[PDB]
Design a protein around this nucleic acid. Sequence first.
RNA 1: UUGGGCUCUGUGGGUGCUUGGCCGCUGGCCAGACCUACUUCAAAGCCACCGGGGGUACCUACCGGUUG
Lengths: 60, 233, 429, 363, 22, 133, 49, 100
Amino acid sequence: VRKLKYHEQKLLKKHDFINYKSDNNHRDHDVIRRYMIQKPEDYHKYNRLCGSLRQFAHRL
Amino acid sequence: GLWVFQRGKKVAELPLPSDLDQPIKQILIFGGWIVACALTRIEVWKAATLEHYTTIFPAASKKGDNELTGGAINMPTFLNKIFVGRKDGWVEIWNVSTGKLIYTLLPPSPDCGAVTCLQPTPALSLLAIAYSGGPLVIQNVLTDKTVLLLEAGTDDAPVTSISFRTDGLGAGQDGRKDGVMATATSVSGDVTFWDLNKGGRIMGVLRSAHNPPSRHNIVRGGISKIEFLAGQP
Amino acid sequence: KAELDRIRRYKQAQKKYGRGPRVDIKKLRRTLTNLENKYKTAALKAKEAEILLENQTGFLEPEGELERTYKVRQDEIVKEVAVEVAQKKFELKLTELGPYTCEYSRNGRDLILAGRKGHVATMDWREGKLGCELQLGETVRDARFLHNNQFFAVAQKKYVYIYDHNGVEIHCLRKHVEVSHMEFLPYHFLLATLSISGQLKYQDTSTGQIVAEIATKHGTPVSLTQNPYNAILHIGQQNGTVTLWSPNSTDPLVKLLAHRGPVRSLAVDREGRYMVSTGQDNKMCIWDIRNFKEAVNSYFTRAPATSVAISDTGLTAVGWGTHTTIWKGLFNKERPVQVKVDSPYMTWGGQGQVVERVRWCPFEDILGIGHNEGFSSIIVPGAGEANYDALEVNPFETKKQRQEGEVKALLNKLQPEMIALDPNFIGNL
Amino acid sequence: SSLAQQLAQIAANSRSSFNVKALKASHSKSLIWEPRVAVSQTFAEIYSQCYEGFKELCHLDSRFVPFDATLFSAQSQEVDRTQMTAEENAALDKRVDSFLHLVGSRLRLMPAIKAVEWLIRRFRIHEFNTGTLLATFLPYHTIPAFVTLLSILPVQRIPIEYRFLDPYIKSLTPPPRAAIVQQATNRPDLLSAISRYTLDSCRAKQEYPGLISFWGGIMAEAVNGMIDKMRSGRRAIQLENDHLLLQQIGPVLSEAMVMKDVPGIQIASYMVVAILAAKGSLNDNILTAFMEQLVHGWTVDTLRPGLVCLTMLAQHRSAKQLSGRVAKAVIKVPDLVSSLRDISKEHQVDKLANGLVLAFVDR
Amino acid sequence: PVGMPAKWDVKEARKYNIEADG
Amino acid sequence: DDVRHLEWSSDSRFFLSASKDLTARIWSLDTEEGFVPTVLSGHRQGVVGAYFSKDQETIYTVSKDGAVFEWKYWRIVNKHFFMQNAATLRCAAYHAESNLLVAGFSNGIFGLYEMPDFNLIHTLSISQNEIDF
Amino acid sequence: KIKALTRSITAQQAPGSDVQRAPRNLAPELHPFERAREYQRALNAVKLE
Amino acid sequence: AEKDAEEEELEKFVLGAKETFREQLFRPAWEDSDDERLTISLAGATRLRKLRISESEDLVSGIEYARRLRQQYLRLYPQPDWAKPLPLDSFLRDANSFKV
RNA sequence: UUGGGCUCUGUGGGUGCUUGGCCGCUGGCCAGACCUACUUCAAAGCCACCGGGGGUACCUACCGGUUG
């Protein structure tokens, strides 16, 4: 994957192999790498407990 | 008795003859035959039915020549035949399917005259017959012509175990040619290897592989058998 | 005298290359005699330019009247066959971490061996270059390369993670949960998955948004492959049916009545002419997949075949139980009525290692078998196409040609709405 | 790193190339040229340079006409080594080894290095036959061509014999025969590998006095160092070490002493036997074996030093009179007492003459 | 280090069985 | 594949194996003269039991996806399932003298069925977790 | 008659030159998606024009 | 003669000569009476299915059976090189030398 | 006690109670052998893990339909 040219980039605007929009700006392993979380599954476990706890605040 | 086991438990017996009084030393299965060699007679059972076939009696000249101390052995491509080594120098060729003494071969160097150990070769139609006076003789047995002659045994300590390697390499001072012999002796615990190509030089000896049979010591050293695990180093 | 044979090469030329019936026949009339003469010489110069091809194909022939091809040992092949590919008959002993899924690239230059207890490794197998060996802990369902040998994707216990050439996790795919089978659409950029709960997920691996999720209704899936010709996608369903799919059609697009038990294994030709599957009812049967017509009275396998994989030429590799057999002439493309192969060809033997996935090299004459004790690699002379085309797929690609081929492929990413049965449908009424 | 070890062993086993970095780095190796000049060089060009050199060597000797027929033929520009079955790679390694035995004398000459540079730059003898190529350049281990060999030599396709050259490959300097002889003492794998070479070139009558003097030198100082190792003074250890020494050296000397048509290596084996009876306290039956074989392998050209070896062997033998064949061929010596007086001006001859004349009493 | 022994695995061998000699 | 269950005869001359693949198999101890050892065909998931009667003609076989088949001589005389909402059949025991089949499930419930013909005696739930044995 | 098919990288670079030799097979079993890749090439042609 | 020397000059220079490069690279005591009376059919047993010449051959004597089974013992194990004097050589091949 | 010492490396056994190597296994093979048959009857349903708030044009799902 060379640095794409002018016409190839504007024919490929949404393209990137590395970041996807589903990857959530790689926030997952910014936090994993920063706080030494030895498993990404434990990231997402903590994430869903954050989500349920915060929607409990919402419905309060 | 001759019991027959499988998986650790007995699955058969074997009918010995009534006329038998001798301890029985060589069990040997080939062809469709189970052949046992006692001390001066050979009892041969048919193996497909475990049923007693005949009993082979060797000739006798001086009441010691009938003794059968080299055992008996089979060649690979020799059909219903068995090769016995006597207390004379003789090795006899017996068609065990029909009982007949078909051929007999005479020792080289008639001062050395009791066959202590014999083994087939990885070559066809050649034997390492092994005499009590020292020589290993290794022979054609349908040309009855010697291929090599070696002086392996001491007169005080002859070869009692002899075993070729069927790996296909091992000899030639780097190790790329076959022809590696192994021999041992009931008097020492040292096994001796022979390159076999040009004239069959020695190449080394494991000294005290097992303990030596020590006079005035209580340990029970010595050797009983050498076998190259066939096809393997 | 010889003009008859000229018309014969004209017949074979417009069979292989003419790609259509022919245009039958005022300004339109002369423009289509123009176009038809240019098409005639285009097919005839392609047929004449077939003589410039470098490599010949491998074979082995029964020179006697009693020596037969399934008896030939690979000591005999490795001795009687050239030393560069006698290098390529290698084995690789890995006992401790599960049965080893294997998969090549599409130039054959790299393989992943995934190990179900966790052990996933990406390598250049010819030069012995271990590009990655990641340990990964928990269980591993499937691994596969993406468009190059530069990114790979592995289906984990819960998600599907994708990784760079150094084995560094670029991202976790969360939207695909308990994916059990994967297939990559290469002319698209379209990572397609079956989960364990029967849900196709068609992603684009270039743009990164999932493009067509469709829950198949047939319960849990038990098989999956991919037609290289159509980009349509064969999932194998445990009522006995090979259910044939697409990102567009939310119904099954065509489902075939294959077997009686769960259909254990699937494969299709790269030319997309035929199909071979096998199930619990131990028959292994083939179809003329264009006409959707079972062309051959079914074969049997001595065990339920956990794998099948068919080659760039006609050889099929069925991996059953603990040893795998190859089969030569199962579907002759040039013959109208398909006859049965009376006897196999090159059985790799059973010595106590259950083969978990068989594969072929795409342009080598080797086969990569994926057993519980690791990866074994055997040589079998007939397989692999001799002549490649380095415009499309290059087994010897430098970094310049990797980067150029990647960006040309991204400029020719087909759209997911372009997938159908007959793929030359574009431009009809 | 189990898979790393198995793939590493596949990669070091790999005799071919599959990326363009290794076609260029593989075609780059050369004796004559530089890397930058050797990369961009086709095989018709190298065949022109070399085959000029092989025309020169075909003028200089005469046994190179069959290698014009095979190895330096006009058709051997297009023989890739790695697309050849193992019968073809075996036969081609036979012709390569016989050619290299034949060349190994004239190897300080640029026509010989041109012919060897065609064998390297096409047939990759530096990648397929490194034992014979190190065995042929190893006598000339002081000339700089041996160091160009040590810069094209692949570090992990070298026999374990020859792996002492690793710091000399690493720092490009020619090794001394102190190092060659020292690892020849410790490794019998090395000392046999030299003597497997030199005897192989003499069954085909392709010897030269640098090979003869080089081999006899290494056997000389090497067997000196081996006897100094094998001494222990513990009786069963020195017995077992004497047997091990005879089993190592034994067959090499047993052909070399009898090789009458090469009087050089005949004299070198006389030399090592004289060292062996002199410093090594070998038994009387062993020394009668050396004397009887010395007596059998006998030439007009090796009369005069062989008599000196009879004086050494008989002098260190502990028993009194000789045995048979020794007395018979020493009868066949023409100028006996005069030659033994000329020897006795510098050696001790009296136990040899005593064993002779006592055996003549017993005839 | 070079020349250390490999681990012993059992080498296969198509050996000759003798029950066809009869 | 794996073999989940083993059930003998009453006279201890035949026994029969409930798979983990899909099938059951009927097997001897010594060679009978009109018997070839044979395979009881397709369920959906894989059999958790395969039990004899008293009269050794009809053979019962109980899969994991709820279905229980009756085979005669070797085809199948009547396959019959039963409904269950979110659970799969994980154990089954058959008393051949009193002709009754219990079946414990993944959701803590067991069903109890008199079976010469499919006929529910009873069912109730004992756990919130699966029934193992 | 056991012949495999053998390739070295000599058919990629003849050694002694730098021509990346590019062989090509024009049998349509290796180049799928004629109408569709030429559609996407044509769409990029209009977008670039 | 069909191939002149000029034509072979042009065949060497133009076409290639790997065929000629390859061609230049590649340069009793006793008798048993039983084996007339030990006839064996070869296609009975599975291990003897594979030492007959053609498919339609069974009736094989003990002599011919001995020859085929010799050829297969050579096939599993070819004949060794050792099976086809000097005082120090005799000293090395004598085991009276190597004592304690 | 006619050498010793550190360090590093390799191989084999051990670190859980001893029932064989392989297969298409009630039998056969470990030198293998034979290779491609046989067929009356597609499928029973349910369930099936994406973090929180929010948008809904297009696609998809589901619900109610509408003509043709």
